[PDB]
Structures are given as structure tokens and as C-alpha cells.
Enzyme design. Structure first.
Site, PDB file in Angstrom:
ATOM      1  N   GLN A  98     -10.420   0.535   2.059  1.00 32.88           N
ATOM      2  CA  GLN A  98     -10.939  -0.392   1.058  1.00 32.88           C
ATOM      3  C   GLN A  98      -9.805  -1.073   0.288  1.00 32.88           C
ATOM      4  OE1 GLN A  98     -11.759   2.837   1.304  1.00 32.88           O
ATOM      5  NE2 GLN A  98     -11.407   3.947  -0.622  1.00 32.88           N
ATOM      6  N   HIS A 140       7.569  15.717   8.307  1.00 33.39           N
ATOM      7  CA  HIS A 140       6.707  14.638   7.809  1.00 33.39           C
ATOM      8  C   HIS A 140       5.226  14.822   8.170  1.00 33.39           C
ATOM      9  CE1 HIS A 140       9.040  11.589   5.695  1.00 33.39           C
ATOM     10  NE2 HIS A 140       9.967  11.578   6.644  1.00 33.39           N
ATOM     11  N   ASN A 151      -2.799   6.544   6.524  1.00 27.65           N
ATOM     12  CA  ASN A 151      -3.529   7.360   7.478  1.00 27.65           C
ATOM     13  C   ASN A 151      -4.202   6.495   8.539  1.00 27.65           C
ATOM     14  OD1 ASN A 151      -6.059   6.396   6.516  1.00 27.65           O
ATOM     15  ND2 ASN A 151      -6.237   8.061   5.028  1.00 27.65           N
ATOM     16  N   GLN A 186      12.772  15.258   9.951  1.00 28.74           N
ATOM     17  CA  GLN A 186      11.671  14.362  10.287  1.00 28.74           C
ATOM     18  C   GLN A 186      10.444  15.109  10.841  1.00 28.74           C
ATOM     19  OE1 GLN A 186      12.270  11.568   8.660  1.00 28.74           O
ATOM     20  NE2 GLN A 186      14.270  12.555   8.335  1.00 28.74           N
ATOM     21  N   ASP A 238      16.903   7.560   4.479  1.00 29.00           N
ATOM     22  CA  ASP A 238      15.503   7.648   4.031  1.00 29.00           C
ATOM     23  C   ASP A 238      15.422   7.403   2.505  1.00 29.00           C
ATOM     24  OD1 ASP A 238      14.567   8.427   6.568  1.00 29.00           O
ATOM     25  OD2 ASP A 238      14.042  10.487   5.961  1.00 29.00           O
ATOM     26  N   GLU A 294       5.595 -37.541  29.501  1.00 25.74           N
ATOM     27  CA  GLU A 294       4.497 -36.612  29.196  1.00 25.74           C
ATOM     28  C   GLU A 294       3.193 -37.376  28.989  1.00 25.74           C
ATOM     29  OE1 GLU A 294       5.635 -34.169  25.794  1.00 25.74           O
ATOM     30  OE2 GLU A 294       6.659 -32.815  27.117  1.00 25.74           O
ATOM     31  N   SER A 345       7.179   9.448  11.470  1.00 21.79           N
ATOM     32  CA  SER A 345       8.647   9.371  11.507  1.00 21.79           C
ATOM     33  C   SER A 345       9.146  10.045  12.789  1.00 21.79           C
ATOM     34  CB  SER A 345       9.206  10.074  10.246  1.00 21.79           C
ATOM     35  OG  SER A 345      10.634   9.935  10.122  1.00 21.79           O
ATOM     36  N   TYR A 352       0.854  -1.197   0.000  1.00 16.93           N
ATOM     37  CA  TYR A 352       0.000   0.000   0.000  1.00 16.93           C
ATOM     38  C   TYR A 352       0.887   1.244   0.000  1.00 16.93           C
ATOM     39  CZ  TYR A 352      -3.387   3.506   0.716  1.00 16.93           C
ATOM     40  OH  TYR A 352      -4.138   4.615   0.448  1.00 16.93           O
ATOM     41  N   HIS A 368       2.910 -41.103  20.817  1.00 14.08           N
ATOM     42  CA  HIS A 368       4.227 -40.553  20.459  1.00 14.08           C
ATOM     43  C   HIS A 368       5.287 -41.603  20.762  1.00 14.08           C
ATOM     44  CE1 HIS A 368       2.283 -36.568  20.402  1.00 14.08           C
ATOM     45  NE2 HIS A 368       3.413 -36.003  20.013  1.00 14.08           N
ATOM     46  N   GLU A 394      12.860   5.231  16.371  1.00 13.60           N
ATOM     47  CA  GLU A 394      12.796   4.630  15.038  1.00 13.60           C
ATOM     48  C   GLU A 394      14.142   4.921  14.325  1.00 13.60           C
ATOM     49  OE1 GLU A 394      10.382   6.797  12.292  1.00 13.60           O
ATOM     50  OE2 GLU A 394       9.920   5.037  11.052  1.00 13.60           O
ATOM     51  N   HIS A 395      14.620   6.170  14.397  1.00 11.68           N
ATOM     52  CA  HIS A 395      15.892   6.561  13.787  1.00 11.68           C
ATOM     53  C   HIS A 395      16.745   7.131  14.895  1.00 11.68           C
ATOM     54  CE1 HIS A 395      12.900   7.087  10.491  1.00 11.68           C
ATOM     55  NE2 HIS A 395      13.847   6.545   9.753  1.00 11.68           N
TER      56      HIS A 395
HETATM   57  N1  LIG Z   1       5.720   5.951   4.907  1.00  8.17           N
HETATM   58  C1  LIG Z   1       6.279   6.991   5.588  1.00  8.17           C
HETATM   59  O1  LIG Z   1       7.514   7.116   5.707  1.00  8.17           O
HETATM   60  C2  LIG Z   1       5.518   8.097   6.266  1.00  8.17           C
HETATM   61  C3  LIG Z   1       6.194   9.203   6.995  1.00  8.17           C
HETATM   62  C4  LIG Z   1       5.296  10.240   7.626  1.00  8.17           C
HETATM   63  C5  LIG Z   1       3.967  10.148   7.532  1.00  8.17           C
HETATM   64  N2  LIG Z   1       3.242   9.102   6.841  1.00  8.17           N
HETATM   65  C6  LIG Z   1       1.749   9.083   6.808  1.00  8.17           C
HETATM   66  O2  LIG Z   1       1.216   9.239   5.510  1.00  8.17           O
HETATM   67  C7  LIG Z   1      -0.206   9.426   5.742  1.00  8.17           C
HETATM   68  C8  LIG Z   1      -0.885   9.999   4.518  1.00  8.17           C
HETATM   69  O3  LIG Z   1      -2.348   9.787   4.653  1.00  8.17           O
HETATM   70  P1  LIG Z   1      -3.315  10.365   3.499  1.00  8.17           P
HETATM   71  O4  LIG Z   1      -4.673  10.555   4.080  1.00  8.17           O
HETATM   72  O5  LIG Z   1      -2.789  11.573   2.777  1.00  8.17           O
HETATM   73  O6  LIG Z   1      -3.155   9.088   2.473  1.00  8.17           O
HETATM   74  P2  LIG Z   1      -3.704   7.570   2.612  1.00  8.17           P
HETATM   75  O7  LIG Z   1      -3.284   6.846   1.401  1.00  8.17           O
HETATM   76  O8  LIG Z   1      -3.251   6.926   3.874  1.00  8.17           O
HETATM   77  O9  LIG Z   1      -5.299   7.588   2.660  1.00  8.17           O
HETATM   78  C9  LIG Z   1      -6.039   8.295   1.744  1.00  8.17           C
HETATM   79  C10 LIG Z   1      -7.301   7.458   1.605  1.00  8.17           C
HETATM   80  O10 LIG Z   1      -8.075   7.456   2.846  1.00  8.17           O
HETATM   81  C11 LIG Z   1      -9.418   7.289   2.604  1.00  8.17           C
HETATM   82  N3  LIG Z   1     -10.129   8.334   3.324  1.00  8.17           N
HETATM   83  C12 LIG Z   1      -9.911   9.684   3.263  1.00  8.17           C
HETATM   84  N4  LIG Z   1     -10.731  10.391   4.043  1.00  8.17           N
HETATM   85  C13 LIG Z   1     -11.515   9.415   4.632  1.00  8.17           C
HETATM   86  C14 LIG Z   1     -12.588   9.501   5.570  1.00  8.17           C
HETATM   87  N5  LIG Z   1     -13.049  10.648   6.079  1.00  8.17           N
HETATM   88  N6  LIG Z   1     -13.184   8.320   5.974  1.00  8.17           N
HETATM   89  C15 LIG Z   1     -12.713   7.135   5.453  1.00  8.17           C
HETATM   90  N7  LIG Z   1     -11.724   6.976   4.579  1.00  8.17           N
HETATM   91  C16 LIG Z   1     -11.162   8.145   4.203  1.00  8.17           C
HETATM   92  C17 LIG Z   1      -9.581   7.423   1.068  1.00  8.17           C
HETATM   93  O11 LIG Z   1      -9.826   6.165   0.447  1.00  8.17           O
HETATM   94  C18 LIG Z   1      -8.266   8.006   0.578  1.00  8.17           C
HETATM   95  O12 LIG Z   1      -7.885   7.628  -0.774  1.00  8.17           O
HETATM   96  C19 LIG Z   1      -0.295  10.297   7.000  1.00  8.17           C
HETATM   97  O13 LIG Z   1      -1.237   9.732   7.939  1.00  8.17           O
HETATM   98  C20 LIG Z   1       1.113  10.243   7.575  1.00  8.17           C
HETATM   99  O14 LIG Z   1       1.125  10.055   9.008  1.00  8.17           O
HETATM  100  C21 LIG Z   1       4.020   8.075   6.212  1.00  8.17           C
HETATM  101  N1  LIG Z   2      11.746   9.060   7.283  1.00  5.33           N
HETATM  102  C1  LIG Z   2      10.673   8.205   6.741  1.00  5.33           C
HETATM  103  C2  LIG Z   2      10.481   6.965   7.640  1.00  5.33           C
HETATM  104  O1  LIG Z   2      11.721   6.230   7.776  1.00  5.33           O
HETATM  105  C3  LIG Z   2      11.003   7.764   5.314  1.00  5.33           C
HETATM  106  C4  LIG Z   2      10.873   8.836   4.272  1.00  5.33           C
HETATM  107  C5  LIG Z   2      10.299   8.804   3.041  1.00  5.33           C
HETATM  108  N2  LIG Z   2      10.562  10.012   2.435  1.00  5.33           N
HETATM  109  C6  LIG Z   2      11.273  10.762   3.269  1.00  5.33           C
HETATM  110  N3  LIG Z   2      11.471  10.078   4.392  1.00  5.33           N
HETATM  111 ZN   LIG Z   3       3.689 -34.028  19.565  1.00  4.72          ZN
HETATM  112 ZN   LIG Z   4      11.935  10.951   6.168  1.00  2.89          ZN
END
Ligand SMILES: NC(=O)c1ccc[n+]([C@@H]2O[C@H](COP(=O)([O-])OP(=O)(O)OC[C@H]3O[C@@H](n4cnc5c(N)ncnc54)[C@H](O)[C@@H]3O)[C@@H](O)[C@H]2O)c1
Ligand SMILES: N[C@H](CO)Cc1c[nH]c[nH+]1
Ligand SMILES: [Zn+2]
Ligand SMILES: [Zn+2]
Ligand SMILES: NC(=O)c1ccc[n+]([C@@H]2O[C@H](COP(=O)([O-])OP(=O)(O)OC[C@H]3O[C@@H](n4cnc5c(N)ncnc54)[C@H](O)[C@@H]3O)[C@@H](O)[C@H]2O)c1
EC number: 1.1.1.23
Lengths: 434, 434
Positions: B188, B262, B211, B259, B360, B414, B237, B130, B419, B326-327
Site C-alpha cells: 500500500q 541478512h 519484502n 551477508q 555497507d 526514408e 544481499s 521506501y 522531414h 552484487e558485492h
Molecule cells: N535493503 C537491504 O539492504 C536489504 C538486505 C537484506 C534483506 N532485505 C529485505 O528486507 C525485507 C524486510 O521485509 P519485512 O516484511 O520485515 O518489511 P517490509 O517493509 O518489506 O514489509 C512489511 C509490510 O508488509 C506488509 N505485509 C506484511 N505481511 C503481509 C501479508 N501477509 N500480506 C500483505 N502484506 C503484508 C505490511 O504492510 C507490512 O508493514 C526482507 O524481505 C529482506 O529480504 C533488505
Molecule cells: N549489504 C546490504 C546490501 O548492499 C546493505 C546493508 C545495510 N545494512 C547492512 N548491510
Molecule cells: Zn523524424
Molecule cells: Zn549488509
């Protein structure tokens, strides 16, 4: 005297073949979930008091000291036979040899000059082991759990088992270096370990199977931030035997029955290209069952057993791979050659002289294995479950300089200017000095 | 001002200390949980029809074909700059190099003569990835997830991302061998991967950040028998920097800010034995923050940030190990030497030229790591998360005979007669064939 018999696989419909390889679902049981929920909250809130109250309502004699003393441990060891102690020593020695062989070699590479990346391991700091009680506890699980914990270098290893704890469990614990053993069982023991009490230490991870309450308790604590991690989800155990025309029916039948006697929900399966082998194994299973001291449990498990006749060995392998059995026993002439084609199974046994019993007790492999389909993604318990991988990187001025533009490009493309700026600041400081 | 208050660690009570280290709250409402439960149930039931219904409400692309076509991926690739494509190639090569170095060597030993035990690995057969979307998605995560899956030999590798999927994700997926990319997001998408639909395959394990809804969906399908296993929980992060008097304030500040940008719940911590260093870092953070396009988000993260003055470096290490960052960035003169004392952290960066931005994006280590202190029991994502260990044993007639008495003794203790009988039957057959 027979609850059904042999299934000709290719005579089944497509729908039946898919249901034949499905596993019995779990009923949730909102009532068990709430009872355990309340036991967990009560133990975290009221510690030993809570545990003693529980004990008072089950044991008849209420537990007093929660921790088993060194003197009780020494008296228990003195009551055991030399024959039994020597057998446990052989088992622990083999388990130790195999798990020691699992140590990860160093991972240390320069992905490009001056960019040194490593993967190192660190032990889970404190681990808690749970062992079900009773007059005849499966104390061998103590050897399977405490040994790799010791090899991994876990700093604290503790164990909980329902009182009164059998001499065998106390001796197995001592033998494997277990530091503290506590008189507590069920969901309350899982809670005491996950949360800590005045007597029981809070551990980072909990290992060991148990009944529905223990299982539900482990489930619950793994889902709470104030809880603890667990080894692996649970479910009904299983054995799948692949046998060809050269197998010995009594050997096959004895392996199916070893697993059937574990519990009424054990699943035992035979896959064989020869209808004749299926009939002979079914008769052997019936004759051997008749002689088991307490065959009520095995009889029940056999109602879900499936003795399947297939077209050939390739089809046996396809069916087993789809099922992903906890234990796979291969009694065919070319057993080892088939292993390369096995994609899902917990532990594999090859040939006529490798009963499941040999692995359960002394070959050296771990008998704590994924069941209920979890072999799809989970591994046999091993050294890796008692430790964790951590990465490390050090870039020299040169390695960093050579990679800087690439990092800036990528950070700019994700519109993460701060990530980009941490690189720019260093590039500028380096130009400034050079 | 808020992050600007230097915390004199040793002037704080132990109670205050514990609260300072807490991450911003993550409680996951009952509102969110019911909504996710409905989405999953509905997707398992109504498949693609349900997906499309959500592709209207929570979306605004009106998805028709769920699968992105070869032609759409080719047009996307053509639109990207050679500079970006080349930077992605560098990153992928380094990630490939480091993860290839993680391949487990053979484990094949005779615990005793004639008792051969092995541990082999098998890939998780199907994995779904995802990737959150938006106009500026973090496509780098595609490289972090798809590359190890490729090296592990996962047979099916698919990816879901909310439509419209940025050219950057499409290119990254193709570059790493991803087979199918689907136009579906949120809870979904996780449900589609866990249950499968007419268009999206049911996979064995799901990976990827998201999210609240995505995260809860992953937690839910991981707890359902009709679901899929997941990698680990994804969190904001975090970065903890340990700095001595030789550190450069601007470098420290830039890493903390890298960080903090983010999102509002990211947490950054500085541990240093010099108040002067802490004050200089706070000033550097304030001036660098003002130049950031994402200053609003970073300022929010900084509310939970901590600039902590310790009595010495040993206490920095002790506090870092308790928190489990984490880091972890060690900007000290003897950074390498502190590593052996680091027991809990996801990915460690050493010296002044190892900004976290390097790991990263392109050093080769994995940026998918445990947060919330989960490093106490969980590993950095790595090759092992895309495979599983399977054990194999073969006892020869001689090895089985040497072990038979040991096994019978243990099984008898046992009270597992079947066995024990599995061994007796074999011992007797060998005696007759002798
Ligand atoms: N991978 C990483 O390194 C990293 C680093 C920092 C943050 N993040 C996270 O990335 C996330 C991005 O989330 P986002 O929302 O932009 O993308 P997302 O892909 O997590 O979710 C978006 C999807 O959420 C669903 N959605 C939206 N609003 C909704 C609602 N009200 N009810 C139900 N479903 C709903 C929809 O299907 C939409 O396409 C943040 O939460 C953040 O914390 C990831
Ligand atoms: N610091 C995040 C979690 O390790 C990874 C990321 C993606 N893009 C930038 N930073
Ligand atoms: Zn056994
Ligand atoms: Zn980062
Ligand atoms: N590790 C293996 O290889 C393996 C193989 C087969 C079976 N097993 C399992 O071993 C288990 C044996 O467990 P056990 O139940 O005998 O011992 P146990 O250790 O799981 O639990 C004993 C505890 O259960 C508590 N308890 C009993 N009834 C209760 C109730 N109604 N409500 C709340 N608490 C209750 C007792 O007071 C005590 O604390 C079985 O569930 C079986 O499936 C393990």
C-alpha cells in the site's frame, strides 16, 4: 476542411487544461499479449525451426539462411548511390563525435584519508538491435543504435530486421561495425535475441522500436529472468513547438508535419503567446499537408494536434514542463535563454535553423528518445545506455582503522552483529601486529 | 554441515557448475500478485481511507495522521545517542563526497562548425523512498537513498516506512533533508507513492528494498501507465569473495557471514585456487557462526552458499564475471590489478582491510546494488538514478546550410517528405535572404 483549430488556453476550464495535456492510454489487448507469449515460448523451445515456421507463414519465400552473408552485404552496398553513402558517413561522423563526448571522466576520490572510492564503467557485453522493415525502412535508426554500442566497447553487436532486408539497412549496419545481421522480424526477432537460437546469439540487452507486437515482445522479455533487458518502454512519438511573434509560420508548420507524418498516433503541439501566430501556423499546416505525397497518416495525427494560445512565454514553458515532450522545438527570439527553465523534454532544438529533421538525421544527437511522458524519469538514448557503472573501494590499514568505530556503531545500531564482527576481527589483527 | 563441502570446480560437469551458481529461487506466486493488484487498485481508488483500512489489518498502530510531525521527529532525535548521531554524520559526509564526485561534466561540442550539440542533466522532480521497518530497521538505507537525491536537486523527496517508525529512520531522514515521512508500509505504501493520496504525493520514481509484497508492488506500478518508475529490483544481499593463499581465513569467513545474516535467501560464495584455503574458511565460518545472535538465519543462507576451489586466479575471475555478484571482495595479493578484468559486479572491495561492512555503512559507495546477475546490464545506484540526460542542439545558418543536403538525402531515402520539406523551406528562405 478543418477538424477544429486554435485553443485559447486561459479560456479553458481547469479540468480541460489538465485533459489537454494528458496522453492517450494504451489498450492492454489480452489477445496480443497471448500471441506474443506463445511466440516467445515457441522460439525459446524450438529455435530456428520455430523462426522458419513463422517465416513460411508470412514471407511467401521461407527464409533459409537466417544470417545475411558478407556477399549479400557487399552487393547491397554496390547498389547504393555515392550521394547516399556520403550522407550516411556525415551522419555517423557527427553521431560519433557527440556520443564520444559523453564518456564519463574518472571518478576516484579518497572520501577520507586511506578510503579510496571509485566509479568505473563497463560495457554491456552483447547488444541486439531491432530495425522494422518494409520498402522504406528508417535505416537511420541503425546509425543511432550501432554507433554508441561501438563507442561503449560492446563485444558483440547484432541486428535483426524482417526479410528481405533493404540495401540501406545492410549498408548502415556494415558502416557501423555491426557483426551479424539476421533475417528475422517482429516478436520472433525479439525472442531470438532475448533467448538465442542455433543461429541467433542470446544478447544481454535489446534496443530499438517497433509495432505493437515488437513492443509487447520487448515488454515481456524484460520481465523474464531468462529474457533480456531493453532500452526503454515505448509509446506514441511527439513534438511540442514553442513559437513567439517572430517565428516563421511555415517553419513551425513544417516541424509539426515532420512529426505528424511518422504515424497516425503522433502528437504534435504548438504553444504560442500570439493568437495571430496560431492562426498562421494552422493555415500553413493545412497548405503544406495538401502537398504531402501520402498525407493520410499526417492528417490522422493532426486530429490530436493542439495549437495552443497562451498568455506569455513563461506560461509556454510551464505547460511544456508539465507535458514533457519527446522533442521540444523553441522558435523564439531568446531561445537559448529558455533552456535553463526547461525541466522535462527528450531533445531540444533552438532557433529557426534547427528543424527536427536535422536531429533525426545528422546533427549528432540521438533520435531514440523517451516519449509518452517517460521523459519524467528516462533519458535520451546515449552512451550510458550501452554500459553500466560499477563501484570500487580500497581502504588502507590506516583508512580502515580510522573508520572502524563508526562502522561498528552503525552495524550495532541495526543489530547486525556479523557485519560488526567483520570489522572487529580486523581491528584486533591490526592491534596484534601493532 | 552442508556449506562445509568443498566444491572442486573442475571435477564438475559444466551442467553441475551452472546449477551451483544459481541464486535461491525467487518465483513470486500468483497468490502474491493478485493481492498486490487489489491493494494497488484499491489505493488508487479509495486513497487514505484504503491506507487506514490496511493500517488495521496488516498493521497495529491504528494510523490517523499519515505524515509524521516535526515534533515527533524532534522527540525521536533527542532520544538517540550522540555516538550514533556522530556515526551517521561520518557516513553521510562520505556518501555525499563520493556521489558529488559523480556529477557529469559539461558536454557541449560542435560536431561540425555551426552545429552545437549539448547533453545537460535535470533532476527527477519527485522521488519517494521506501524503507522497511521493525524494531531494528536498516536506517543506513535512508542515507544511501536520500543523500544522492539531495545532491541531484530532486524538488520533492518523501519517505514511507511501516508504523511505528523507529527513531533511527526519523533521524536519518531529517539528517538527509527528507521533506515528508509517512506512516505507511508494504504494497500500500508503494501504491500511495505511485498514485498519490490525499496525504501522500504521487512521485515520479520510487526507490527502496522490501519484502515480497513491496517488491511485487514496485514491479507492478513500474509496468502501469498510471504508475511510477522504479530504481531496479531489490534482492537478498550476496557476496562473492575471491581469495588467494595469502588471504586470512577469518577475514574471508566474516565477510561471507556478514551477508549471510541478512536473511535466509542471501547467497555467499568463495572462489579460491587452494583447497586448503577453502577448508580453513569453512572451519572459520562454522566457529564464527556459533557466536552470532542471528545464526539461525545465517545457517539458512549458508544452504545456498558455495565454497569453490578453482584451478587458478584467472578462473576465479572468469566464474565471478559469469555470476555477476552484487558485492565482490578480492582478498588477493594483487587485488587492484584484477579490477580491470572484472566486468560484472555491483560494488568491489579490495585487499584485506576492505570488509564489505565498510561499504555497507560508511566508505561512501552506495549499498543499493543489482542482484541476481543483473549487474550484466544494471548499474550500482548512484547520482544518475536520480536525474536524466536531455540533449540540446542549435544549428546556425551556416551549420544548417552545410548539413541541409545531407539531411534531404537521408530523409528522401526514408521516403519522409515532410522531414525533407522542413529543410527545403529553410534552404529557400536563406537563399532569398542571401
Ligand atoms: N535493503 C537491504 O539492504 C536489504 C538486505 C537484506 C534483506 N532485505 C529485505 O528486507 C525485507 C524486510 O521485509 P519485512 O516484511 O520485515 O518489511 P517490509 O517493509 O518489506 O514489509 C512489511 C509490510 O508488509 C506488509 N505485509 C506484511 N505481511 C503481509 C501479508 N501477509 N500480506 C500483505 N502484506 C503484508 C505490511 O504492510 C507490512 O508493514 C526482507 O524481505 C529482506 O529480504 C533488505
Ligand atoms: N549489504 C546490504 C546490501 O548492499 C546493505 C546493508 C545495510 N545494512 C547492512 N548491510
Ligand atoms: Zn523524424
Ligand atoms: Zn549488509
Ligand atoms: N523509430 C522511430 O523513430 C519511429 C517513428 C514512427 C513510427 N515507428 C514505428 O515503426 C513501426 C513499423 O513496424 P512494421 O509493422 O511495419 O514492421 P515491424 O518490423 O515492426 O514488423 C514486421 C513484423 O510484423 C509481423 N506481423 C505483421 N502483422 C502481424 C500480426 N498480425 N501478428 C503477428 N506478427 C505480425 C511481420 O510478419 C514481421 O515479422 C510502426 O509501429 C511505427 O509506430 C518508429
Amino acid at each position: 476542411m478543418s477538424f477544429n483549430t486554435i485553443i485559447d488556453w486561459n479560456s479553458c476550464t481547469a479540468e480541460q487544461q489538465r485533459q489537454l495535456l494528458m496522453r492517450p492510454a494504451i489498450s492492454a489487448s489480452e489477445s496480443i499479449t497471448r500471441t506474443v507469449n506463445d511466440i516467445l515460448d515457441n522460439v525459446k523451445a524450438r529455435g530456428d525451426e520455430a523462426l522458419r515456421e513463422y517465416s513460411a507463414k508470412f514471407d511467401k519465400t521461407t527464409v533459409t539462411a537466417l544470417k545475411v552473408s558478407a556477399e549479400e552485404i557487399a552487393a547491397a552496398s554496390e547498389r547504393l548511390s555515392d550521394e547516399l553513402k556520403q550522407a550516411m558517413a556525415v551522419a555517423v561522423k557527427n553521431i560519433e563525435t557527440f556520443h564520444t563526448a559523453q564518456k564519463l571522466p574518472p571518478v576516484d576520490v579518497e572520501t577520507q584519508p586511506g578510503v579510496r572510492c571509485q566509479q568505473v564503467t563497463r560495457p554491456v557485453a552483447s547488444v541486439g538491435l531491432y530495425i522494422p522493415g518494409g520498402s522504406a525502412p528508417l535505416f537511420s535508426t541503425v546509425l543511432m543504435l550501432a554507433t554508441p554500442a561501438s563507442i561503449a566497447g560492446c563485444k558483440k553487436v547484432v541486428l535483426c530486421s524482417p526479410p528481405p532486408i533493404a540495401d540501406e539497412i545492410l549498408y548502415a549496419a556494415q558502416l557501423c561495425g555491426v557483426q551479424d545481421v539476421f533475417n528475422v522480424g517482429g516478436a520472433q526477432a525479439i525472442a531470438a535475441l532475448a533467448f538465442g537460437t542455433e543461429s541467433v546469439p542470446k544478447v544481454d540487452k535489446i534496443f530499438g522500436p517497433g509495432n505493437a507486437f515488437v513492443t509487447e515482445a520487448k515488454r515481456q522479455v524484460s520481465q523474464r529472468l531468462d529474457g533480456a533487458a531493453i532500452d526503454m518502454p515505448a509509446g506514441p512519438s511527439e513534438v511540442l513547438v514553442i513559437a513567439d511573434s517572430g517565428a516563421t509560420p511555415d517553419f513551425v508548420a513544417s516541424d509539426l508535419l515532420s512529426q505528424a507524418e511518422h504515424g497516425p498516433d503522433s502528437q504534435v503541439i504548438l504553444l504560442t503567446p500570439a493568437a495571430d501566430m496560431a492562426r498562421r501556423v494552422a493555415e500553413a499546416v493545412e497548405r503544406q499537408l495538401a502537398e504531402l505525397p501520402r498525407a493520410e497518416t499526417a492528417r490522422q495525427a493532426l486530429n490530436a494536434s493542439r495549437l495552443i494560445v497562451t498568455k506569455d512565454l513563461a506560461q509556454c514553458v510551464e505547460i511544456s514542463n508539465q507535458y514533457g515532450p519527446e522533442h521540444l522545438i523553441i522558435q523564439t527570439r531568446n531561445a537559448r535563454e529558455l533552456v535553463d527553465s526547461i525541466t522535462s523534454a527528450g531533445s531540444v532544438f533552438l532557433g529557426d535553423w534547427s528543424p527536427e529533421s536535422a536531429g533525426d538525421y545528422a546533427s549528432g544527437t540521438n533520435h531514440v528518445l523517451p516519449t509518452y511522458g517517460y521523459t519524467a524519469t528516462c533519458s535520451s538514448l546515449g552512451l550510458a545506455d550501452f554500459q553500466k557503472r560499477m563501484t570500487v573501494q580500497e581502504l588502507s590499514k590506516e583508512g580502515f582503522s580510522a573508520l572502524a568505530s563508526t562502522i561498528e556503531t552503525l552495524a550495532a545500531a541495526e543489530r547486525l552483529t556479523a557485519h560488526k564482527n567483520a570489522v572487529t576481527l580486523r581491528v584486533n589483527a591490526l592491534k596484534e601486529q601493532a
